[PDB]
Amino acid sequence: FPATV
Amino acid sequence: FPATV
Amino acid sequence: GAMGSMERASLIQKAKLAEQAERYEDMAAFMKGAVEKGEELSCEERNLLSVAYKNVVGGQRAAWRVLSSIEQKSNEEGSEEKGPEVREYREKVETELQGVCDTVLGLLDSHLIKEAGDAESRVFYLKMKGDYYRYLAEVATGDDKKRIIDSARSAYQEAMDISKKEMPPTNPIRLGLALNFSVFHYEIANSPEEAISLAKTTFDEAMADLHTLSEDSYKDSTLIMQLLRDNLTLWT
Amino acid sequence: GAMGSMERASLIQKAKLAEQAERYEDMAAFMKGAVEKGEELSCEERNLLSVAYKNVVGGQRAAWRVLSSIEQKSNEEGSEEKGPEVREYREKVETELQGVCDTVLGLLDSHLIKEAGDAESRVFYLKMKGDYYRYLAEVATGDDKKRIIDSARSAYQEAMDISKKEMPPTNPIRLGLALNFSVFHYEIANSPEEAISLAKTTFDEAMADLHTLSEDSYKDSTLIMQLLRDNLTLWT
Numbered sequence: 001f002p003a004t005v
Numbered sequence: 006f007p008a009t010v
Numbered sequence: 011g012a013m014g015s016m017e018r019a020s021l022i023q024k025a026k027l028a029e030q031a032e033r034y035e036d037m038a039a040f041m042k043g044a045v046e047k048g049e050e051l052s053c054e055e056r057n058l059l060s061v062a063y064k065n066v067v068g069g070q071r072a073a074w075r076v077l078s079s080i081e082q083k084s085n086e087e088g089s090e091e092k093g094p095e096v097r098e099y100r101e102k103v104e105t106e107l108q109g110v111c112d113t114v115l116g117l118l119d120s121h122l123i124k125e126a127g128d129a130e131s132r133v134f135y136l137k138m139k140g141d142y143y144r145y146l147a148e149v150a151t152g153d154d155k156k157r158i159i160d161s162a163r164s165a166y167q168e169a170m171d172i173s174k175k176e177m178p179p180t181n182p183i184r185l186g187l188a189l190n191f192s193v194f195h196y197e198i199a200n201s202p203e204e205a206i207s208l209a210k211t212t213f214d215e216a217m218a219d220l221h222t223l224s225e226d227s228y229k230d231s232t233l234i235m236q237l238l239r240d241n242l243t244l245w246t
Numbered sequence: 247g248a249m250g251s252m253e254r255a256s257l258i259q260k261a262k263l264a265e266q267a268e269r270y271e272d273m274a275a276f277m278k279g280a281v282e283k284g285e286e287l288s289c290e291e292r293n294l295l296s297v298a299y300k301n302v303v304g305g306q307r308a309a310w311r312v313l314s315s316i317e318q319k320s321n322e323e324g325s326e327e328k329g330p331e332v333r334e335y336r337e338k339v340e341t342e343l344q345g346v347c348d349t350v351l352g353l354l355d356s357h358l359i360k361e362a363g364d365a366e367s368r369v370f371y372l373k374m375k376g377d378y379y380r381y382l383a384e385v386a387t388g389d390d391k392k393r394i395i396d397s398a399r400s401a402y403q404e405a406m407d408i409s410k411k412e413m414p415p416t417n418p419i420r421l422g423l424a425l426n427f428s429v430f431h432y433e434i435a436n437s438p439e440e441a442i443s444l445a446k447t448t449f450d451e452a453m454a455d456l457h458t459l460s461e462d463s464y465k466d467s468t469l470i471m472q473l474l475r476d477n478l479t480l481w482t
């Protein structure tokens with residue numbers, strides 16, 4: 001899964 | 006801490 | 011609310027303790043209590059709120075994905091019928107996830123966003139609104155899926171518009187917003203080109219402004235820039 | 247109970263799903279429902295029960311230790327008064343921990359232990375009884391602390407007596423019981439010599455019986471033997 005903050 | 010199961 | 015009798019400062023103190031103890035459900039409940047006092051949140055307090063709910067919903071999303079994968083496998087040819095239990099339990103987790111999202115959205119709507127006038131607060135809350143609509147979108151399959159996706163988009167877009175007018179391109183909130191909106195495009199809106207363009211432009215415009223920053227601000231900005239690069243590497 | 251309307255088999259199915267999703271509170275609630283159906287538990291089902299509650303209480307114990315350390319530091323000379331919040335929140339976590347322990351003890355008493363006639367089941371449940379009294383002892387500070395410690399000891403002792411009569415020295419339940427009773431001696435009963443003697447004798451008697459075992463049984467026994475050795479290394 002891609003990175004989120 | 007020591008090991009328990 | 012169960013936190014109505016506790017002092018605001020005590021709720022904030024306890025949220026910090028809960029974080030140290032990795033008690034994120036408690037942390038979130040404390041912060042919900044703090045928001046419901048009705049006063050605006052400081053920067054540090056906004057961060058406590060976001061960390062708490064990010065960790066709670068993150069755990070729910072991970073569990074939902076495990077269960078959804080098991081459910082999908084059950085619906086393949088040659089899979090033995092095992093009854094309604096997998097769907098039921100995925101639904102249980104899903105409903106709890108939706109509940110958390112609705113709670114957060116409710117705090118934003120009553121009345122965090124409307125009282126937030128500074129760019130840093132308003133962008134932060136609008137990013138959160140986009141994020142929790144995105145989590146709702148991840149699990150949506152019905153009549154309202156399009157409207158949920160559009161709600162996320164609209165919140166993110168308002169946050170982007172303010173961020174571009176009011177914040178430098180290295181601002182970590184601006185960067186994090188762009189990171190997440192880019193993921194929205196890739197994962198929710200079926201717009202991988204838009205996702206990639208946003209991540210690239212955001213990275214490049216930040217790079218060009220790093221020279222203005224102190225060492226400590228540089229550290230913060232470059233951390234998020236690396237997440238942008240990581241996504242770009244994943245997607246290209 | 248909220249699980250009263252769900253089939254036993256469905257509760258067990260869902261406990262396994264919850265484990266896969268690392269949803270240990272759900273897992274424990276499912277297994278509590280399953281126990282409350284009133285039928286005895288199979289080996290696999292006993293393991294589900296134990297894993298679920300071990301993970302729930304383990305998280306509570308870790309949080310309690312974080313909070314207790316902060317509280318202890320607050321009571322040192324030169325520490326600034328910060329009000330009742332640390333004690334309150336440690337108490338909150340403590341009360342929830344005690345509640346989980348009381349729930350498990352309640353399942354054992356109504357009516358798992360009394361119905362358990364085979365050595366493998368009875369020892370397993372009595373080990374659990376000792377373990378959850380030990381968790382209560384960890385946080386006990388009042389009139390009943392001695393009686394709580396004695397309850398743990400008594401449960402462990404009955405389990406040891408049966409295990410020595412009825413099970414080979416390599417049996418993993420016997421080994422795990424001895425491991426945990428040894429930790430009880432070291433950490434709760436202020437009896438480090440007894441702890442060390444038990445761990446050493448258990449290890450050595452297991453070693454001598456490994457030759458009787460299949461490859462797969464050998465793997466199981468040697469895993470727990472290594473935990474015994476790890477504790478001995480810590481303590482000597």
Ligand SMILES: *CC(=O)NCC1CCN(C(=O)C2(Oc3ccc(Cl)cc3)CC2)CC1
Nearest residue numbers: 005053054056057182183186187230233234
């Ligand atoms: C009030 C305020 O300025 N909050 C945002 C900061 C929180 C701490 N930061 C970070 O940990 C990093 O960037 C983040 C984290 C979360 C968000 Cl939503 C956005 C950016 C560097 C990781 C800096 C911003």
Ligand SMILES: *CC(=O)NCC1CCN(C(=O)C2(Oc3ccc(Cl)cc3)CC2)CC1
Nearest residue numbers: 010289290292293418419422423466469470
């Ligand atoms: C019904 C039954 O035989 N249960 C005990 C087995 C569970 C799986 N085992 C293990 O994972 C190891 O030993 C353990 C684990 C838990 C306990 Cl309480 C005791 C021993 C090897 C780790 C084997 C026993």
Ligand SMILES: [Mg+2]
Nearest residue numbers: 016017018019
């Ligand atoms: Mg007040």
Ligand SMILES: [Mg+2]
Nearest residue numbers: 101104105149
């Ligand atoms: Mg649903």
Ligand SMILES: [Mg+2]
Nearest residue numbers: 170207208211
């Ligand atoms: Mg644009």
Ligand SMILES: [Mg+2]
Nearest residue numbers: 252253254255
């Ligand atoms: Mg039935």
Ligand SMILES: [Mg+2]
Nearest residue numbers: 337340341385
């Ligand atoms: Mg107490």
Ligand SMILES: [Mg+2]
Nearest residue numbers: 406443444447
């Ligand atoms: Mg003895």
